[PDB]
Paper text:
Crystals of the [name]–[name] complex grown in the presence of calcium ions and a tenfold molar excess of [name] at 4°C have been reported previously. The crystals contained a large tetragonal unit cell containing approximately 83% solvent and ten [name] sub­units in the asymmetric unit. The crystals did not tolerate removal from the cold room prior to vitrification, and not unexpectedly their diffraction was relatively weak (limited to 3.2 Å resolution). Radiation damage caused rupture of some disulfide bridges, but the conformational effects were local. This structure was determined using molecular replacement, and here we have revisited the refinement in the light of developments in procedures for medium-resolution data. Structural studies of the [name]–[name] complex by X-ray diffraction at medium resolution (3.2 Å) showed that in addition to a carboxylate interaction with the calcium site of [name], the pyrrolidine ring of the d-proline constituents of [name] bound into a hydrophobic pocket formed by the side chains of Tyr74, Tyr64 and Leu62. The approach of each d-proline head group to the opposing sites of the in-register twofold axis-related pairs of subunits of the [name] decamer appeared to be facilitated by a kinked rotamer at the centre of the alkyl linker. Model building of the [name] ligand into the tenfold NCS averaged electron density of the lower resolution [name]–calcium map did not clearly establish whether the peptide bond preceding the proline ring was in the cis or the trans form, and in the deposited coordinates both cis and trans isomers were included for each ligand. Five molecules of the bivalent ligand cross-link and stabilize pairs of [name] molecules, forming a decameric complex that is rapidly cleared from the circulation by the liver.
Numbering used by the authors:
A (entry chain G), B (entry chain E), C (entry chain C), D (entry chain A), E (entry chain I): 1 to 204
The structure:
Amino acid sequence: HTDLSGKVFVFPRESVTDHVNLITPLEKPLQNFTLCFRAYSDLSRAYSLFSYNTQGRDNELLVYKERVGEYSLYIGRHKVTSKVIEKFPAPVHICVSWESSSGIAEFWINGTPLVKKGLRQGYFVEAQPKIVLGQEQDSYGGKFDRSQSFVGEIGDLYMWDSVLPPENILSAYQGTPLPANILDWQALNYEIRGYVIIKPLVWV
Amino acid sequence: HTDLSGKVFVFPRESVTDHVNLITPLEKPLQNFTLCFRAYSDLSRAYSLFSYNTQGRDNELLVYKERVGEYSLYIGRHKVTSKVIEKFPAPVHICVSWESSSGIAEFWINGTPLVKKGLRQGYFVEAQPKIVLGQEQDSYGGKFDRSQSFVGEIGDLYMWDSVLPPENILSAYQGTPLPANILDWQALNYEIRGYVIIKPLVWV
Amino acid sequence: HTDLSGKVFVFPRESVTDHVNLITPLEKPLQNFTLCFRAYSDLSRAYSLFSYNTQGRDNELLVYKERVGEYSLYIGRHKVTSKVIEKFPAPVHICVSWESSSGIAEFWINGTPLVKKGLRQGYFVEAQPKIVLGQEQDSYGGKFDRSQSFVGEIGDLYMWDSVLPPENILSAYQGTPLPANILDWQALNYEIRGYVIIKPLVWV
Amino acid sequence: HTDLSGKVFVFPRESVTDHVNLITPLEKPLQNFTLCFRAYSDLSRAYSLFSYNTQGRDNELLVYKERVGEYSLYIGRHKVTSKVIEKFPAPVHICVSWESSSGIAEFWINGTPLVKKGLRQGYFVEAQPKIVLGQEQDSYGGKFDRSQSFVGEIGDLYMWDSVLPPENILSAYQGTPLPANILDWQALNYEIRGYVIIKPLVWV
Amino acid sequence: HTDLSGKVFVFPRESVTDHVNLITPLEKPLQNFTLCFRAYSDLSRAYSLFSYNTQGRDNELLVYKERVGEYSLYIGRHKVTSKVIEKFPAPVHICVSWESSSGIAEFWINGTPLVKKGLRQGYFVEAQPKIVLGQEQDSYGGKFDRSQSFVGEIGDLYMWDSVLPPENILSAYQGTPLPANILDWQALNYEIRGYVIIKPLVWV
Ligand SMILES: O=C(O)[C@H]1CCCN1C(=O)CCCCC(=O)N1CCC[C@@H]1C(=O)O
Ligand SMILES: O=C(O)[C@H]1CCCN1C(=O)CCCCC(=O)N1CCC[C@@H]1C(=O)O
Ligand SMILES: O=C(O)[C@H]1CCCN1C(=O)CCCCC(=O)N1CCC[C@@H]1C(=O)O
Ligand SMILES: *[C@@H]1O[C@H](CO)[C@@H](O)[C@H](O)[C@H]1NC(C)=O
Ligand SMILES: *[C@@H]1O[C@H](CO)[C@@H](O)[C@H](O)[C@H]1NC(C)=O
Ligand SMILES: *[C@@H]1O[C@H](CO)[C@@H](O)[C@H](O)[C@H]1NC(C)=O
Ligand SMILES: *[C@@H]1O[C@H](CO)[C@@H](O)[C@H](O)[C@H]1NC(C)=O
Ligand SMILES: *[C@@H]1O[C@H](CO)[C@@H](O)[C@H](O)[C@H]1NC(C)=O
Ligand SMILES: [Ca+2]
Ligand SMILES: [Ca+2]
Ligand SMILES: [Ca+2]
Ligand SMILES: [Ca+2]
Ligand SMILES: [Ca+2]
Ligand SMILES: [Ca+2]
Ligand SMILES: [Ca+2]
Ligand SMILES: [Ca+2]
Ligand SMILES: [Ca+2]
Ligand SMILES: [Ca+2]
């Protein structure tokens, strides 16, 4: 339980080895959830932001940037993509929620809502995951791909087991987030593997 | 008669099956009319916003987006198109009126008037329609086309049997519309067919 | 003598038949003159705004839009073109003057002066004209061309037999023009031929 | 000695004949010098702004616009070019200085300094020149080229036999220039040859 | 020890000969360091800003502009590149730091931080350098390349043997920098070789 307030992870080079493991207890399958964080990268190609796999299931929960201005969400291998107008390169605050009952996934880029899309209505996201920043898993905790690796900075990451209202998403964007029960940036359990450096956050 | 204030329809995936039926009594043929609503979609291709058919007549009244920045109005199979400068993707408030006596159709995008165009002077729009959101009809209530389907969110839909003055169009754009006698968002009769979800409106 | 204050002509479709005839006494050949009006059209091709012909002389005085951002003035079949930065589609207030003694023609788009150009120094523009909005004449009052027709809205048209100073051109742009002695929008003699509708001006 | 305050030269058509001769005594070779003026033209091709030749020497001192956003200075046939961000077409206030001792030529477009460049260090610009607006000389006062001719308006022209500090360049840009000892717009000796008209300056 | 406050070096032409040697004692290998300066050039090709070589080691420390919007840092032949949105041509204030312990290099363009990148973790930058402005060294003080030469103006150069905090980088950008212990613009030891002129700084 480490307090990373005002710090970021820095993945300072393209690689197939550098990454961070996020550790959560969880154990109960996910029905609703909201995830959010800040990222800053000048990659033009595609990259994984947040990779969440479980035993036997690739891309169980994956936030993945297709290209400038397109964000994709995977839920149990099914995919959904939404577009937004953004500058490049630029810092972004990404936030994504998904609700099993309706299947709706809303993206929120820099406090602006993208078009809602739907997938996997009725599905339950599997538990006891391996979660990875800086690489995209194609196995249970490994088999990475260099050309999907993330190069840049990530911080202010939070994950709740519910769907945040707009009022609460704004709070997170403005740096005063509600306390999170799946991943909290101020009490984070993480392993660093490879070349990842922790530095102060100087771009918000 | 359901009050959808502050809610929207969400057509969360491309399909040939998802759609909403709007139900109005009407019965008397339409001479003048104003239609308006909000839409938010990141489709680059063409799509139907509002499809209104009658027994034996395709595209009797159809609002249809050709491509970014071009809105078309069909009246009795005749078509008229007007251009506007818009960002993309972005939420839009569309509003369109048509007057039989003059044949003039004015479009109003986000409270800005497009160039007036004319068609079907003297025509009477047929009554007892089937009205459909989220798909484009090529029959009396069906025979849809996937590549014309609407994917995104629609709300704040109103339809009057008269032509609104500018003062009243602004009112609708600003969220304080006059009460409507053909379709009112606050007392709406609708059927949902397929995958359509109702959610709160978070983008105005 | 009809007062069209706050109204516009609407040429609502492309055609070779719709047009308006403007009627002025004149009778004395034109030495100096200023013309101005508002127009709103989303045509990308070329079109005639103001066509003024006399017996035996085509394009005696013609204001003609070549393409987006280029305005041409014809004086006795001689042509002159000036460029400007404009958005599209957008409403414009055009104003053009010409002085025989110097041959100089200045264009003024939305109150901004274009580069001055010269032509026909010493020429006298012929009298007893047929003047036409919405079509381009290739005869004395007819032989139109569909692909030069104007589609959109025109209003606030004034024509003086002198050259307005800048102070007066601004006045016209801002909607408080000096009274005009060749064509006055507030006492206009006009015939409508074909499909032309008069509607209120809603875009200024 | 004519006062052209608030007036401009208008070169109203492309030609190989229209031009203005500027007349100065000078007689002593130029070591340092600053030149400046306003110009307004919608030509996309190359054109000469200011052409200064002497007996037996082409392009002794020549300010020449290569294309949109590139200004060239010739000093004794040697050339130097600097770039700037500008809108087009648009009025510009150009100002250029050159210092023999250092060879440095600074351009100042609309009160903004371009990158300094150098040429002809140690050179002395020849005296008893023929100076021409509106054409580019390839002889001592003539042998013009149509495709280098200037078409548009020029005014507020001043030339000093020293190098103005920044404070003084701003003054000239803002319309309150120091009195000039080589060419002064308020006491100018000029011949008009061909089609050149003097009109009031309406674009500053 | 010369005070260049409010002056710049001007490399006024492309060449393989013009350059400036910067002289520092140093002698102790560099572990951390921050470098910063202002530059103004309208070159579209690549150029070296700051070239620092040591006996037997090319590109030991090199700041090098790849193209518009891309800045590269070399540390012991290894390279790292970061992107930024900039206008062109435009004056820029560049500032770059590097820390051996972490290998992290941060760029700061006009007071804005680029994405951090990493290289040469653990490395020690060699001492007793030859440092050169206006050319890129491929030997110990020479063997230049014309097509990498810098053409424009450089000034306000400072270099510290530590890593400046953000607060101090802002100070340097705003013209009130902390005193520097490797290179100080207000006490600079430099040789000028070739065509380089010192002029006042007129573009900040
Ligand atoms: O990698 C993933 O888990 C998913 C998530 C988003 C990107 N992606 C893709 O599958 C896109 C390409 C993946 C791998 C790939 O391109 N190929 C191409 C040849 C073999 C290999 C594969 O599909 O297994
Ligand atoms: O579908 C409509 O009702 C109208 C309204 C806007 C688009 N549209 C069109 O007709 C354009 C194309 C429609 C369908 C189509 O393109 N084709 C082409 C082959 C079969 C099918 C048809 O003509 O029935
Ligand atoms: O119509 C006019 O009077 C002037 C006004 C501006 C354009 N224009 C033209 O004449 C351009 C071309 C007009 C007609 C045309 O293009 N052609 C091409 C072949 C037959 C026909 C003709 O010149 O008679
Ligand atoms: C998820 O949210 C829905 C909608 O509020 C709710 O009905 C359900 O009980 C929630 N499930 C869990 C596990 O929190
Ligand atoms: C439609 O509006 C026109 C005014 O142009 C009016 O004359 C007519 O009575 C109206 N008809 C209906 C059915 O509202
Ligand atoms: C036209 O304008 C010129 C320039 O002032 C003037 O000399 C002349 O008298 C005017 N003639 C007419 C008929 O307006
Ligand atoms: C030109 O300027 C230089 C430097 O400012 C000066 O030394 C010299 O006296 C000047 N010469 C003339 C003729 O103005
Ligand atoms: C380099 O910076 C690190 C981090 O602050 C510091 O521990 C070290 O003493 C510095 N080394 C030198 C030589 O300044
Ligand atoms: Ca995978
Ligand atoms: Ca993969
Ligand atoms: Ca149809
Ligand atoms: Ca269809
Ligand atoms: Ca004609
Ligand atoms: Ca014609
Ligand atoms: Ca020449
Ligand atoms: Ca020539
Ligand atoms: Ca080298
Ligand atoms: Ca080299």
